[PDB]
Design a protein around this ligand. Structure first.
Ligand SMILES: *[C@@H]1O[C@H](CO)[C@@H](O[C@@H]2O[C@H](CO)[C@@H](O[C@@H]3O[C@H](CO[C@@H]4O[C@H](CO)[C@@H](O)[C@H](O)[C@@H]4O)[C@@H](O)[C@H](O[C@H]4O[C@H](CO)[C@@H](O)[C@H](O)[C@@H]4O)[C@@H]3O)[C@H](O)[C@H]2NC(C)=O)[C@H](O)[C@H]1NC(C)=O
Ligand SMILES: *[C@@H]1O[C@H](CO)[C@@H](O[C@@H]2O[C@H](CO)[C@@H](O[C@@H]3O[C@H](CO[C@@H]4O[C@H](CO)[C@@H](O)[C@H](O)[C@@H]4O)[C@@H](O)[C@H](O[C@H]4O[C@H](CO)[C@@H](O)[C@H](O)[C@@H]4O)[C@@H]3O)[C@H](O)[C@H]2NC(C)=O)[C@H](O)[C@H]1NC(C)=O
Ligand SMILES: *[C@@H]1O[C@H](CO)[C@@H](O[C@@H]2O[C@H](CO)[C@@H](O[C@@H]3O[C@H](CO[C@@H]4O[C@H](CO)[C@@H](O)[C@H](O)[C@@H]4O)[C@@H](O)[C@H](O[C@H]4O[C@H](CO)[C@@H](O)[C@H](O)[C@@H]4O)[C@@H]3O)[C@H](O)[C@H]2NC(C)=O)[C@H](O)[C@H]1NC(C)=O
Ligand SMILES: *[C@@H]1O[C@H](CO)[C@@H](O[C@@H]2O[C@H](CO)[C@@H](O[C@@H]3O[C@H](CO)[C@@H](O)[C@H](O)[C@@H]3O)[C@H](O)[C@H]2NC(C)=O)[C@H](O)[C@H]1NC(C)=O
Ligand SMILES: *[C@@H]1O[C@H](CO)[C@@H](O[C@@H]2O[C@H](CO)[C@@H](O[C@@H]3O[C@H](CO)[C@@H](O)[C@H](O)[C@@H]3O)[C@H](O)[C@H]2NC(C)=O)[C@H](O)[C@H]1NC(C)=O
Ligand SMILES: *[C@@H]1O[C@H](CO)[C@@H](O[C@@H]2O[C@H](CO)[C@@H](O)[C@H](O)[C@H]2NC(C)=O)[C@H](O)[C@H]1NC(C)=O
Lengths: 75, 113, 122, 493, 75, 49, 49, 98, 493, 75, 75
C-alpha cells in the first residue's frame, strides 16, 4: 500500500542524516536475501532461463541477476 | 432501556481456578444490519478506574490478559476466566451498547476464597 | 498513551448549578464522540450523557434528562458538562469516556478518565 | 437438496465393486452422488474447526520507549559502556560524536556515544499452531427426499464428526440406511505449515516459514506478562542527526503494514472456537448399506399440478415442484420425457425416484432435461401434467465447461483432483502418480512466484519453445507456457 | 511486518477468496506505473542500456522490460 | 513560520453502520438510500441465491 | 420511453451512452454515468460552466 | 401481463446547484465536499490564476465544478419473464358462412 | 500591469518604419508591446458584438401532428388522393395495403392508401445571419502605469471601438498620449459564410453550407405568423405494420441531436446583444503620438520596502510590488539588474518607466531577469534593497516554447499568423504569400476531415513516403504526413 | 451520442415492419452523399492514396471505396 | 438524423474551445470500440477479406483497418 513507495531518491539531498538512513538502507537487499533463502527452486529456473535466452556470458549474468532481483521485489 | 441482569452477585474463588460470570439481557442485543452482538465487559479494580476487557461478546480488548474470554448468542452471555490470579479483585460490570440509553448491570464482585 | 483528566469537581449545596470540564490529551479530539458517566458510591455504573463527533448532536439519560447540558470545546481539546438543578441524589464520581478506537458501535467506551467527585449536600 | 443453488456443485456419478466412490469436499462446493439403485444424496464439508491451540511464537507490533539513558567516553580511548546495556529489556546502539573543549573532553576527536532505552512492548501478535490430534471435520449429508421445505435449506442435514483418531464415522440416515464415510483427514491443508496470526481478533492461515521470516521482534512464545523480546533493534530508530548527539524514537504501530503484508493469506473466523472455513477434505463413500425408501410402492394414477413454476438452475437442473391430488398417499410418482413427441427418454432424474408420502404434501423434483425441446410427463392418463421446457445450450459447450471446471479443480487441489470422483481404476492411479511427480517438481520450481511473474515467465518460456527446434519446443511450450499462464490467471483465489 | 513480504504465491491455495485479493491483485502494477509516470528519464536510460547490451530483438526487449520492472519495485 | 495546511490524509479509520441489500437475478443492481451520503463507502458485489 | 414501447436486444440496450439506475423502485434513483448528459464548457481557460 | 424494471436509462435532465472550488497553481488538486455525493456530477479542469485572482503565484491552477443532477422522463427498460406470457391463437373453420 | 497571468500573452517588442508595428488581436490573450522610450501598453480584443440580426432560414426540432385523415383506394382502380394533399402544411405519404370483401372492396389485391397529417412545428431553430452593416469590435488598451491595482485587473483600461464603417480610431490614453490604431475589421474573420443559429437560448456559430445541409424542415424565416415547412417528412414517421393500415408519429424532439451535431462549433452569448467571444482581429499600431509619463521627473533617493514577494509569470517575467517610503513624491525609480557575482547587466525592464505617483500607493515593477541567478537592485545606493530571484530554464527552452507557440499560431490563424508582430520587409511578405498558397491547397484538399482520420492519413502518408524509392517525392510525402499529424493533433481546441 | 450505433443487424428479424425502416436505410446511405458533395477535394486525396497503395485495379478500387466510406462516417 | 455529420473540419478553427470538444472526439472513436467488442465475428470476416484481397502486408493491414472502421460506422 503506502510502504511500497518510500521517499527514497526523490532528489532533495542534504548533509543532515535522513530518517531511518541506517535501517532502511539494506531493507530491500535483506528482503531479496530472505526470499532467495526461502525459495531455492527459482534459482534453478533462472539459471535455465539465462542459459537458454543469453548467447553471451555477460548476457547470461545480467539476465540471471535481473531475474533474481525482479521476482522477490515484485512479491 | 434494556435492563441487564447478572446471575452472580459475589464470586469467591481460590487462585488458579476458573470462574464464570453471567450477564443476561432483557432483549436480544443482536444488531440486524451487521449481525453483531454489542455486549461489553468492564472491570473497575478497587481504588481504580474501570477498564474494558472484552469490547464485544467474545472479542477481547487490547492489553487484556490471555484468560479473559466471553460467549453467548442472544441473551445469555458469559465471561470465562481460566486461571484466577490475585489481581482479579474488582467489579465485572457488563454493558449493552445496542440502544442509545445504554445501561450497565449491577456488577458482580470477585474475591479470593 | 491517551490521558483524560477531570476538572471542576467540588462541594455544592442542593439547587446550585455546576459546570464540569473534561480535559483531553493524547489523540485528535474533534473526531471522537465523548461521554459522561457517573458512579454513585456503592452503586452500579450509570451513563449520563453523550456528544457525538458533530457538535450539534447530543443525548442525555432520562434520569438526568432536562437537568444537564453537555458541550465540546474541541479547539481547546476539552469537554464541558453543565449540571443544573443539582439534587442530593446527584452526587457521584464522574468519569469522561472516549469513543471506541476500533469497533462498529458509533458510541462506546475504551478509555476512562481518572474521575472527579461532586458532592451535593447541605 | 441442500446443494441446489450454490452454483459450485459437481455431480459424481460412478460406482464400483463394494459400491465405494471417493469424493473431495472443498468448503465451497457441495458434491452430489448419483447411482443406479442408490438414492442420490449431496454432501458438503460444513466447517473445519480445531481446539486447544498452543502458542509457538509471539510478535510485537508496536512499542513504547522510556528511560532514555546515554553515556559517552573521552575520544581516542576506550569505547562507551553502560551497565544498562546487558539488560535484556534495553535496546542500545553505539555511535561516534565529535567532542572537544566545548564538550569538556581533553583531546579533540570523535568519541563513542551509546544510548539505551527501555523497550516495553505492546499489542503482541500471537502465533498459534495446531496439532493433528485436535483437528475436527464436520460433514453434512442429505438424501433427495422431496420434502416440502428442502430446496437449498442450509440447516436440515445429518452431521458426522470426523477426527484423525476416529476417521471412519458413518452417518445413519433415517429410512435410507447408513452411508459409510471412510476418509483420511491427514491429507488436506497441511497444518504443520500453518501458523494462526491472532492479531487484534483477526486470524489467518499463513505459511510457517513466512511467519518465522517476519522482521518484527519476536518473543519467547511462553505464557508470561513481561516476556523478553529478541531483535528489538528494528522497531526503534536511533537517529544521529549531524554529529552532536543522537535521539531515540519508537517506530510506530505496524498494524497497517501487517495487513498489507498479509495480502495473500486466507482469513479464518476466530471467535471462541477457531473454526477455519477454508480447506479441503478427501473422503470415500461406502454406499453398500445404503438403500432408497419406497422402491416397492405402487404407481400414482391421478392429477398432478405445479405449485411453484419450474425454474432452471445454473447447472441445468430445473427443480420441478408438484403436489398430488389423489387419494392414495403412499405412492410413487411416474415420469416421462419426450423430445419432439418421441419417447427417447433422453432425460434423467437427479432425484432417485420421488414419491408422495402424504395426500396434499407438496413434493419437489430435480430433473435434468436434454439440450433441445423436452416435454415432461409426470402423471399417467389424459390428466398427465405436461411441463414444456427448453434447455438453451449445446453438448460441446457442456464438455468445454466440464473441462474448464476440471482444470480449475486441478489448479486448486494439487493432485487430489485425480481422486475426486475416481471410481477405483488403474488408469487413474497412473495419472495420479504422474501428476504427483510432475506437480511436485513444478511447485518446487515455481515456489512463491507472483501473480504477474507467472504470466510473464510463461509467455517468455512459450516464446522460447516456439523458437527452439531441437524437439524442445514440444515439451517446453506445452508443459510450461500454457500451464503457467493458466495458473497465473487463477492463483489469486 | 513491513509491507515487503506478502503471502502472494507461496503456500496453500484454496477455493475461498484469500484476504485482500481483489484490492491487491494489481497493487505492484499500479506502483510501477505511477513510478514510471513520475520518473520518465529512466525509460531513456533503460532503452540505452538494452540497446547497448547483448542485442537481439528478443534479448533487447526482455532485458529492457525486466530492468523496467526491477528498478521501480526495487526502489 | 506561519504554515498553511492544504491536505488532511487519514490513517486510522472506523467503520460504523454496515448495511446490505440484495436482489433477485435479472432484477437490477441492489440500491440503498445511504449511497448518496459523503460519509458512506459502499461497494457492489454479486451473490448466488 | 414516453408512451411508445419498443423491443430491443439485451446487449444493445446495455451498451448505450446514457446514465442508468438499477430500476429498483426507489423514490430517488442513483445515476451511474451522469457525465454523458452534462457538458462542462471552458472558454479560453479562465472559468468553466 | 407483468413486467419488471431491469434498468432505467434517462434522456432529459436538470442541473440544480452549481458550486466551484478552485485551487492555487501548485498547491495541488481541487476538492469539493459534495464530490463524494453520488448525485453531484463533478469535473476537474485547469485555469490560470494570479494576483488578479488574489492567488499570489502565477501559474495554472486546478478548478472543479459540481452540479447537482436529477433526471426527468427516464427510459424504463422493462424485461418480461416466461412466468406469465400468453400467446393467443384464433381458429376459424371454412363453414361457408355468409 | 494588466493581463499578466493570461496564458496566451506574448510580447511584440519591435517597431519599424514610422514607429508602427502590425499585430493580430485575438480573444484568447493580450499583447505586451514594447518600444524604446515608449510606454509598454497592453492590448486585449475584449469582445465582438453584432447589434442587429436577420433570420436567413428557420429549421425546427420539435413538432406536432394535429389532424390525421386517410383515403384508401381499391387494388386496381389506381392511386389514392386526398383533398388536403395539395395543402402545404399537410404531410402525406402513399403506401400499399391489401383489400378484399372484408374491407368491402370487391376485388382482392393490393390497394393504395395515403395518410395526411396536419403539421405545425414547435420551438424552431432561428439561423440568424449577421451582415457587416453593424458589427462592433471592442479593444481595451492598458498602459503599464505601475499602478497599485494594475497587477491583474481586468476592468481598468482605455477602450477603443472598431466598426467596419470607421475602422481607424484613436485611443486617448490619459497621460501618455493618443495611440494611433489602424485595423482591418472586415478581414479578421469570414462573417459572411457563417450563420449564428439560436436554438432554445444558446446560440452557436456554424458554417453556411453546414447549416444549409441539415435533415430538418425549414421555412424561409420571413416573419410570417404561420411559416411553410419545406421538408416535413424528415420529422414524421409513417409506420405500417404487416400491411393492413398505417399511422403517423411525430418522432420526438431533436434538441439533443442538435447538441450532438454541433460539436466543434464555438458557442456565443445570446442574452441581450448577441456578443461573440471567439475570433480574432488584425490591427496596425501607430505609436508616434506617445509621450512617456514623467520623463522630466527626478530620481528618487530613499529606501524601498517590499509588500508582496517577487513571483514569476509563466513567461519568466517577475512582478515586483514595492513601497516607496520616501519624502519626494513624484521622483522616478532606478532599476538595475546586477547579474550573478558581477556587475553585468543582461536583464531588462518591461514596465517602460516606473514612477511613484504617490508616496502612499505601492507601485508594481516588472522585470525579466537573466536565466541564471540574478540580483535585481531596485534602490539608489548602499541602502538599495537587493531582491534575489533565481530563474529556472535556459535559452534553448525559451526557443523551443517560442517555436511551439508560433506553430500553434500558424495552425489557428492560417496565413494571417505570418504578420503578427511584422515589421514589414520582403522576406516576411514573401513567406506569407508562399504559405498562403500552400495552405490554400492544403485546406482545399483536407477540408472536412475529422482529427482521427487526419492523424490516420498523416501516418499513412509518412509511411508511403518512407517506402518510396523516389527521393524527390518521398521527402515531400514525409513532410506532408508530418504536417498532417501535427495539425490533427491540434485541430480541436 | 445515442443516435450512433442504431439497432441494425442484431438478428431480431420478423415478418412485421420495424421502426423507421426505409428512412433509416436511406439516411444512412445519403449522409455519405451529402458529405462528399460538400467537400470534394478529399476525392482527390483518396484517389491519390488508393492509387499509390494499390498495386492492382481491384485493390485500388476497393481501397478508394473504403476511404470514401470511412471519412464521412469517421467525421 | 442530425446527430450524424457533426460540425467537424469545417475550417473555422479559433483559439477558444469549441462545443463538446473532448467528449465529441472520444465518443466518435469509442463507438467503434463498443461495436467491435459487441460483435466479434466480423473481425474474422474482415481478416479473411483483407487477406484474400491484399497482396502485400501494407495493403493487407490498410484494408483490414479500413473495413473495421467502415462497418461500425456504416451500421
Ligand atoms: C447508525 O447506527 C447507530 C447504532 O448502530 C444508530 O444509533 C441509533 O441512535 C438513535 C438516536 O440517535 C437511537 O434512538 C434511541 O432509541 C431508543 C429506543 O427506544 C424505543 O425503541 C423502539 C424501537 O424498538 C421505538 O419504537 C420506541 O419509540 C422507542 O424509541 C429510544 O428510547 C431513545 O430515546 C430516548 O433516549 C433519548 C436520549 O436519552 C431521549 O432524548 C428520548 O426522549 C428517549 O428518552 C432514542 O430515540 C437508536 O436506539 C440507535 N440505534 C442503535 C442500534 O444503537 C444510528 O441511528 C444509525 N444511523 C445513523 C445515521 O447514525
Ligand atoms: C440549491 O439551490 C436552492 C436554490 O437555488 C437552495 O434552496 C434553498 O431552499 C431553502 C428552503 O428549503 C431556502 O430557505 C429559505 O430562506 C428564506 C430566507 O430567509 C432568510 O434568508 C437568510 C439569507 O438571506 C438566511 O440566512 C436565514 O436563515 C433565512 O433563511 C427563509 O425566509 C425561508 O423560511 C421561511 O419560509 C419557510 C417556508 O414557508 C418557512 O417554513 C419558514 O418558517 C420561513 O417562514 C427558507 O428557510 C433557501 O433560501 C434556498 N436557497 C436559495 C434560494 O438560494 C438549496 O438549498 C440549494 N442546495 C441544495 C442541496 O438543494
Ligand atoms: C382538426 O381536428 C380538430 C379537433 O380534433 C377540429 O377542431 C374542431 O373545432 C371546431 C371549432 O373550431 C369544433 O366545433 C365545435 O363543435 C361543437 C359541437 O356542436 C355541434 O357538433 C355537431 C357534431 O356533433 C356539429 O355537426 C354541429 O354543427 C355543432 O358544431 C359546437 O358546439 C361548437 O360551437 C359552440 O362553441 C363555440 C365556441 O364557444 C361557439 O362560438 C358556438 O356558438 C357554440 O356555442 C363548435 O362549433 C369541432 O367540434 C372540432 N372538431 C372536433 C372536436 O372533432 C378541426 O376542425 C380539425 N380540422 C382542422 C383543419 O383543424
Ligand atoms: C428449512 O427447514 C426447517 C425445518 O424443517 C423449516 O422450518 C419449518 O417451517 C415450517 C413452515 O415454515 C414449519 O411448519 C409450521 O408449523 C407450525 C406449527 O405446526 C404451523 O402453525 C405453520 O403453519 C407451519 O406449518 C415447521 O415447524 C418448521 N420446522 C422447524 C422450525 O423445525 C424451514 O421452513 C426450511 N426452510 C428454510 C428456508 O428455512
Ligand atoms: C481594479 O480596479 C478597480 C478600480 O480601479 C478597483 O476598485 C477599487 O477598489 C478599492 C479597494 O479595493 C477602492 O478603494 C476604496 O476607495 C474608497 C473611496 O475612495 C475608500 O473610502 C476606501 O477606504 C478604499 O480606499 C477604490 O475606490 C476602487 N476604485 C473604484 C471603485 O473605482 C479594484 O479593487 C481593482 N482590483 C480588482 C481585483 O478589481
Ligand atoms: C524509568 O522511568 C520511570 C518513569 O519516568 C521512573 O519511575 C519513576 O520513579 C520515581 C522514583 O525513582 C518515582 O518518584 C516516579 O513516580 C516514577 N514515575 C512513574 C512510575 O511514572 C523510573 O524510576 C525510571 N527508572 C527505572 C530504572 O525504571
Amino acid at each position: 500500500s503506502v510502504a511500497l513507495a518510500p521517499h527514497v531518491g526523490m532528489g532533495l539531498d542534504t548533509r543532515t542524516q535522513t530518517w531511518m538512513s541506517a535501517e532502511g538502507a539494506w531493507r530491500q537487499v535483506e528482503k531479496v536475501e530472505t526470499w532467495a533463502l526461502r525459495h531455492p527452486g527459482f534459482t534453478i529456473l533462472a539459471l535455465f532461463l539465462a542459459h537458454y535466452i543469453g548467447t553471451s556470458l555477460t548476457q547470461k549474468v545480467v539476465i540471471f541477476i535481473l531475474l533474481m532481483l525482479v521476482t522477490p521485489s515484485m512479491t | 432501556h434494556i435492563v441487564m441482569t447478572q446471575s452472580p452477585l459475589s464470586l469467591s474463588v481460590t487462585p488458579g481456578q476458573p470462574a464464570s460470570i453471567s450477564c443476561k439481557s432483557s432483549q436480544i442485543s443482536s444488531w440486524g444490519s451487521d449481525g453483531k452482538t454489542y455486549l461489553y465487559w468492564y472491570l473497575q479494580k478497587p481504588g481504580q478506574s474501570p477498564q474494558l476487557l472484552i469490547y464485544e461478546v467474545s472479542s477481547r480488548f487490547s492489553g487484556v490478559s490471555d484468560r479473559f474470554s466471553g460467549s453467548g448468542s442472544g441473551t445469555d452471555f458469559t465471561l470465562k476466566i481460566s486461571r484466577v490470579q490475585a489481581e482479579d479483585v474488582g467489579l465485572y460490570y457488563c454493558m449493552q451498547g445496542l440502544h442509545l440509553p445504554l445501561t450497565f448491570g449491577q456488577g458482580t464482585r470477585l474475591e479470593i476464597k | 498513551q491517551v490521558e483524560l483528566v477531570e476538572s471542576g469537581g467540588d462541594v455544592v449545596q442542593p439547587g446550585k448549578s455546576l459546570r464540569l470540564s473534561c480535559a483531553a490529551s493524547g489523540f485528535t479530539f474533534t473526531n471522537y464522540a465523548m461521554h459522561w458517566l457517573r458512579q454513585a458510591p456503592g452503586k452500579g455504573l450509570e451513563w449520563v450523557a453523550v456528544i457525538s463527533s458533530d457538535v450539534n448532536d447530543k443525548y442525555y439519560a432520562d434520569s438526568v434528562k432536562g437537568r444537564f447540558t453537555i458541550s465540546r470545546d474541541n479547539s481547546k481539546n476539552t469537554l464541558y458538562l453543565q449540571m443544573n438543578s443539582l439534587t442530593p441524589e446527584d452526587t457521584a464520581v464522574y468519569y469522561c469516556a472516549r469513543e471506541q478506537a476500533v469497533g462498529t458501535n458509533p458510541w462506546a467506551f475504551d478509555y476512562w478518565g481518572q474521575g472527579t467527585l461532586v458532592t451535593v449536600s447541605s | 437438496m441442500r446443494c441446489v443453488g450454490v452454483g459450485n456443485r459437481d455431480f459424481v456419478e460412478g460406482l464400483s465393486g463394494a459400491t465405494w466412490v471417493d469424493v473431495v469436499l472443498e468448503h465451497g462446493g457441495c458434491v452430489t452422488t448419483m447411482a443406479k439403485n442408490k438414492p442420490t444424496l449431496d454432501i458438503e464439508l460444513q466447517k473445519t474447526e480445531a481446539t486447544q491451540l498452543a502458542t509457538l511464537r509471539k510478535l510485537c507490533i508496536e512499542g513504547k520507549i522510556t528511560n532514555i539513558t546515554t553515556d559517552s567516553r573521552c575520544p581516542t580511548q576506550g569505547e562507551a559502556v553502560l551497565p544498562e546495556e546487558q539488560d535484556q529489556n534495553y535496546v542500545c546502539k553505539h555511535t561516534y560524536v565529535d567532542r572537544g573543549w566545548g564538550n569538556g573532553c581533553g583531546l579533540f576527536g570523535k568519541g563513542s556515544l551509546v544510548t539505551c532505552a527501555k523497550f516495553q512492548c505492546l499489542e503482541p501478535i500471537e502465533g498459534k499452531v495446531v496439532q493433528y490430534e485436535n483437528l475436527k471435520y464436520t460433514v453434512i449429508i442429505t438424501v433427495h427426499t422431496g420434502d416440502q421445505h428442502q430446496v437449498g435449506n442450509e440447516t436440515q442435514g445429518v452431521t458426522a464428526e470426523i477426527t484423525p483418531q476416529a476417521s471412519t464415522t458413518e452417518a445413519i440416515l433415517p429410512e435410507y440406511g447408513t452411508l459409510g464415510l471412510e476418509c483420511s483427514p491427514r491429507t488436506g491443508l497441511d497444518f504443520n505449515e500453518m501458523i494462526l496470526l491472532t492479531m487484534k481478533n483477526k486470524a489467518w492461515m499463513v505459511h510457517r516459514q513466512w511467519f518465522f521470516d517476519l522482521p518484527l521482534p519476536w518473543a519467547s512464545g511462553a505464557t508470561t506478562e513481561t516476556p523478553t523480546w529478541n531483535r528489538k533493534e528494528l522497531l526503534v530508530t536511533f537517529k544521529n542527526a549531524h554529529a552532536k548527539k543522537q535521539e531515540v524514537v519508537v517506530l510506530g504501530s505496524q498494524e497497517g503494514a501487517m495487513h498489507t503484508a498479509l495480502t495473500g493469506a486466507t482469513e479464518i473466523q476466530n471467535s471462541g472456537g477457531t473454526s477455519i472455513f477454508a480447506g479441503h477434505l478427501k473422503c470415500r463413500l461406502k454406499m453398500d448399506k445404503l438403500e432408497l425408501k419406497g422402491m416397492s410402492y405402487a404407481m400414482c394414477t391421478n392429477t398432478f399440478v405445479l405449485k411453484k413454476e419450474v425454474s432452471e438452475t445454473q447447472h441445468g437442473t430445473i427443480l420441478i415442484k408438484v403436489e398430488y391430488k389423489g387419494e392414495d398417499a403412499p405412492c410413487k410418482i411416474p415420469f416421462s420425457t419426450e423430445d419432439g413427441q418421441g419417447k427417447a427418454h433422453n432425460g434423467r432424474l437427479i432425484t432417485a425416484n420421488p414419491v408422495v408420502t402424504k395426500k396434499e404434501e407438496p413434493v419437489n423434483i430435480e430433473a435434468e432435461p436434454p439440450f433441445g425441446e423436452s416435454n415432461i410427463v409426470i402423471g399417467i392418463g389424459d390428466n398427465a401434467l405436461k411441463i414444456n421446457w427448453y434447455k438453451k445450450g449445446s453438448s460441446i459447450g457442456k464438455m468445454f465447461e466440464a473441462t474448464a471446471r476440471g482444470a480449475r479443480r486441478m489448479a486448486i487441489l494439487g493432485d487430489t483432483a485425480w481422486d475426486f470422483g475416481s471410481v477405483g481404476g488403474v488408469l487413474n492411479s497412473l495419472g495420479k502418480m504422474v501428476h504427483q511427480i510432475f506437480g511436485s517438481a513444478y511447485t518446487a520450481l515455481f515456489s512463491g512466484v507472483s501473480w504477474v511473474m507467472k504470466i510473464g515467465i510463461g509467455v517468455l518460456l512459450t516464446w522460447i519453445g516456439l523458437n527452439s527446434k531441437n524437439t524442445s519446443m514440444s515439451f517446453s511450450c506445452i508443459a510450461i507456457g500454457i500451464i503457467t499462464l493458466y495458473l497465473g490467471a487463477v492463483v489469486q483465489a
